[PDB]
Each structure stands twice: as C-alpha cells, then as structure tokens.
C-alpha cells in the first residue's frame, strides 16, 4: 500500500496539527501519520498553557510585558544554552500563534486569568478551557476534519526515504504489521515529540538520571523522529539535558496539575515545617531542592483564597479524588490540622506561615524572594499535598534553523525535511520554562507546514 501527498506530517500533537492545518491552508494535500491509536501526544495530557508577551488577556488584566523580557526570561532559564534566534522567533510569533488558535482553530482561553510559571518575570501564560490540552486537541481534530486533513492512526513512521540528491521524498511506516509508503512531493515534517518515555535513550544520554519512577508521560514519546533523522545524517544537540517536573505524585511520578496553585501563592513546606526554595524558581532548581529535603519530598499548601483565583482543585477533580483516597492530599479547616495530617511540627509550620503572611502584606519575601509575591494563608480551609520530583521532559533533539529546516552534521539543510516541536533541541537550553513548550510547538509547527507547502514539487 502507498499514498502520495504534498506534505507528510509525522505526529498528531500540537506541532503536527499546526503544520497540517497550515499545509492545507496553502492549498496543498497533506496527511498526519500517528503511531498510537489515538491522537494528541504529550500536547493532550499537558496543562497546555501557552506563554505570550503582549496578549489580549494581558491587556484585559492590565499586565505589562515585552518581547525583550520574555526572550530574556527564556534564555536565562536555560542557562543561555538555547539558540537565541530560535527563542527570538518563538517570542516574535507567539501573539500570532495564540490568536490563530483562538480565531482559526476556535480554542477557548480564559479571558481574565494567566499563569506565571517558574522562571517568568510576569504572568504571561494563556489558559485553555479546562486547564489541559483536551480542549486544544479536540478543537484541532474538529478543524482537521472540517478542512479534509486525514489522520492515519496506528501508523508508525520507521524510515525516511531519501533520493540520490539527498532530498527527503517520503516515509515508510508500519501499519498492522505491513509497510506503507508515503510519498511526500513537497516535504516531510517530523513532529514526533520528545523521548522521555524511551527508558533506554534516557540511560544512554544521561546515565545519572533519577530512576525512582518509570515514565508517566505519553507512551509515544520515544525518540523515533531523532533516530530516523540521524540515520540520514541529521544533527542532534543537547541530548543529555533531561528535566524533572518538581511536583509529582510520590507513588507514580505523574505530574500533579492540581498543584498549579503554586503559580498563585501556594507554598512548598518540608517535613520540618519550613520553606526551603522559591516557589517560582526554575523546575531544575526546585527539583534539586526538594530532593535535598527530608525524605526527598515536599508538601504543597494552599487555601480557599488561592483556589478562588486559581481554580486548580475545581479543574482537576480526578487528581483530587485519587490523591485523597491514597492519603497523599487532605482538605482541612486549620493550619494545625494541616500539620497534624502529615506529621509536620505544629509550632514550626505556624511560625513559617506567620512569616508568609507578613511577606505577603509587604510584598517582600525575605526568605526566598518570591518573584510575584506571597499570598496570605491565615484563613482556611486548606489543601495540603505530598509531592516529589520526577523525570518528564527532554531538552535535546534535532537541529533545525528558524525556518524548521533540518540540518545535517555540517550544518547544511537536508532538502525536503522539516521538524517542529518537542522533537527539536534548540529552544529550551538546559531547562525548559513552563508554558514555553506550547509556544514553541505552535509557532514552529505553523512554520514547518508553511515551509513544507512552499517547497518545490519533487519531479
Ligand atoms: N514513529 C512515529 N510515527 C508516528 N507518530 C509518532 C512516532 N513517534 C511519535 N509519534 C507521535 O508524535 C506525537 C507527538 O506529539 P507530542 O508529544 O504532543 O509532541 P509536540 O508537543 O512536539 O507536538 C505523539 O502523538 C506520538 O505518538
Ligand atoms: Cl514588546
Ligand atoms: Cl514551572
Ligand atoms: Cl547534552
Ligand atoms: Cl484530574
Ligand atoms: Cl512542559
């Protein structure tokens, strides 16, 4: 079996959907091939907030931001190892990308609230309905069906087809145990996501990683796009940088979205009843700090006042129910009860919270310099959650230019081959900031579809 399209997109996350829609919008034929039985990838299960400097929501909220500040926050957050041009192009196209999701894809974002992720100097992450990628991927799927973009699931790309000139002209894929050839007359877009679910590749590129947990990310994120492209001499970079998310389930390592209250004033409290790290630091910094606390865990403590702004309990009822059943989260009326349920010394917790309340009133966190400002915690009820870090995201991957063209080991364009999203390795440096993967995947997915659509037809 064979198919022919102008643009063959590998992967049905945000990058691949963005590329596919742009290819169709240019009048080209296209397909998305997806290895798993269902679409969406990591982009579906992510919280799916998206950083933008200069958004309509910041205007609604009276928040001042700038592209310069967003670029600086991003580059500093990855130890200045990110490619500056890749970061600049991400930031320069962020407003257009978000407005395109709103107006073309019909994604619904909250008009009056934003997340400030760790490492960001102001609130700048747009929030999709429901605080997950379900809204985004569902809207993408509807739009793809409307415009006629086929999605072939259970179709695993295995080999890039290269002609004698070095141009990529198709993809061989496995479907139901048979090889299917996809001829790509204008381009192939690799949009396969990261490699954090490939435990062997983790081991190869970072032999000292945390091994307490298996993968709890998307099972399709196994590095196949890197492997296939390296076989045809694509370059890869930054492969050893592999990030832990700091606030994960102690029993499984899964990301706890309910603890997104951290972006709205929740405090991290160790077993001694003390704060120990700035709650809006970088993910690596916080993860390292938690691992240094007694038992290698932290508590996350917040109140109804914070829920009334953040809504993370309302939005993540499955997590609430499961953590509560497992004795990993409690809702209590008083700070004394919050201490008692987790064996925290009461006098120490009360003293810490007295300090927090003072720092909230003055705006000056004398202990850890909270970059947004703490929130008073004198009134309950309270939620308290036990958490630990776990490995979740790969920073490395394919080398591309800002046009998404894949580069070989000499830095030369591989004709007909584009890559976008979490498969690429040049945006985030040593350490991704929250909310920036979505900005990257949409900006570069769109560019990849535009560039593949204009690439000349293979005769
Ligand atoms: N070999 C492959 N063939 C086809 N699809 C693949 C292959 N490897 C990974 N994928 C898919 O690519 C998608 C990547 O989506 P996602 O993880 O959201 O990445 P991004 O955020 O970069 O869009 C996943 O649904 C994953 O199953
Ligand atoms: Cl600006
Ligand atoms: Cl974060
Ligand atoms: Cl590396
Ligand atoms: Cl949930
Ligand atoms: Cl992320």
Residue numbers in the entry: 0, 130 to 587
Quote the paper:
Interestingly, the fecal microbiota of type 2 diabetes patients has an increased capacity to produce imidazole propionate (ImP), which is catalyzed by the bacterial enzyme urocanate reductase (UrdA). The structure of UrdA′ was determined at four specific states: an ADP-bound structure without substrate at 1.1 Å resolution, and three FAD-bound structures in complex with either the substrate urocanate (1.56 Å) or the product ImP (1.40 Å), or without any ligand bound (2.56 Å). The X-ray structure revealed that UrdA′ adopts a two-domain overall structure (FAD domain and clamp domain) connected by a hinge region (identified using the DynDom server). Based on the structural and functional data presented, we suggest that apo-ADP represents an inactive state, while the binding of FAD induces movement of the clamp domain that enables binding of the substrate urocanate to form an active complex with a solvent-accessible channel for water-mediated proton delivery to Arg411, and subsequent protonation of the substrate.
In addition, we obtained a structure of UrdA′ with an ADP instead of FAD. Notably, this structure does not include any bound ligand, even though the sample was supplemented with urocanate (hereafter called apo-ADP). In the apo-ADP structure, an unambiguous density was present for ADP. In addition, density that could be best accommodated by a glycerol molecule was observed in the expected urocanate binding site. The closed conformation of the apo-ADP structure implies that the urocanate cannot be bound when ADP occupies the FAD-binding site, which was supported by the ADP-induced inhibition of UrdA′ activity. When comparing the apo-FAD structure with apo-ADP structure, we also observed that the absence of the flavin group resulted in the clamp domain moving toward the FAD domain, thereby creating a closed, solvent inaccessible conformation. Phe243 is now positioned in the same manner as in the apo-ADP structure.
